[PDB]
Amino acid sequence: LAVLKLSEQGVLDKLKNKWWYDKGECGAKDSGSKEKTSALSLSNVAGVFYILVGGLGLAMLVALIEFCYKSRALFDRGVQMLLTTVGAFA
Amino acid sequence: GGLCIAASEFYKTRHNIILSAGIFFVSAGLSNIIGIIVYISANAG
């Protein structure tokens, strides 16, 4: 009679939910849906944006130093041969 | 970039303070979207 009394009052429900879960704290169903990866989310292609912002910021740092190089203003003909002779031996 | 605008109202005919200012507002924007991207990417983690 005591076992049937504890079940209908949700005591066996309460003693189950307490011991298996409060001494738990590992995550349950953290994956969830299998269609969470249906939409090709940002973490899949975030590297292309890292190339893109790295591409723009590389262009700004080269455009500025061309600007001072215009504000400052091929080196030679015998020594541009020397750039060929060194690189050929290399 | 906000300091260079007050450096443009005085100190006329420098003609690089405007050029220094305008790239600073844009480079703040590129620092913003790279802050947006790492926020949305690591929010999945």
Are B17 and B7 a contacting pair, CB within 8 Å?
Answer: yes
| Alpha carbon of B17: minimum distance to chain A alpha carbons (Å) | 14
Mutation to test the A interface, candidates B18, B34, B43, most A Cβ within 10 Å? B34
The residue type found at B38 is: V
The residue type found at B18 is: I
Chain B residue at shortest CA distance from A42: B41
Q: Does A52 touch chain B (CB under 8 A)?
A: no
Cross-chain residue pair A42–B23, CB shorter than 8 Å: no
Tokens of B18: 């405007």
Resolution in angstroms for this experimental structure? Answer: 4.0
Residue B38: how many other CB atoms lie within 10 Å:
14
Q: Does A65 touch chain B (CB under 8 A)?
A: no
Q: Does A42 touch chain B (CB under 8 A)?
A: yes
Q: A56 φ, ψ to 5°?
A: -70, -45
Residue B24 and residue A3: Cα distance in Å, rounded?
Answer: 75
Are B25 and B1 a contacting pair, CB within 8 Å?
Answer: yes
Q: Where are the alpha helices (DSSP H) in A1-90?
A: 2-8, 11-19, 46-72, 79-89
List the determination method. Answer: cryo-EM
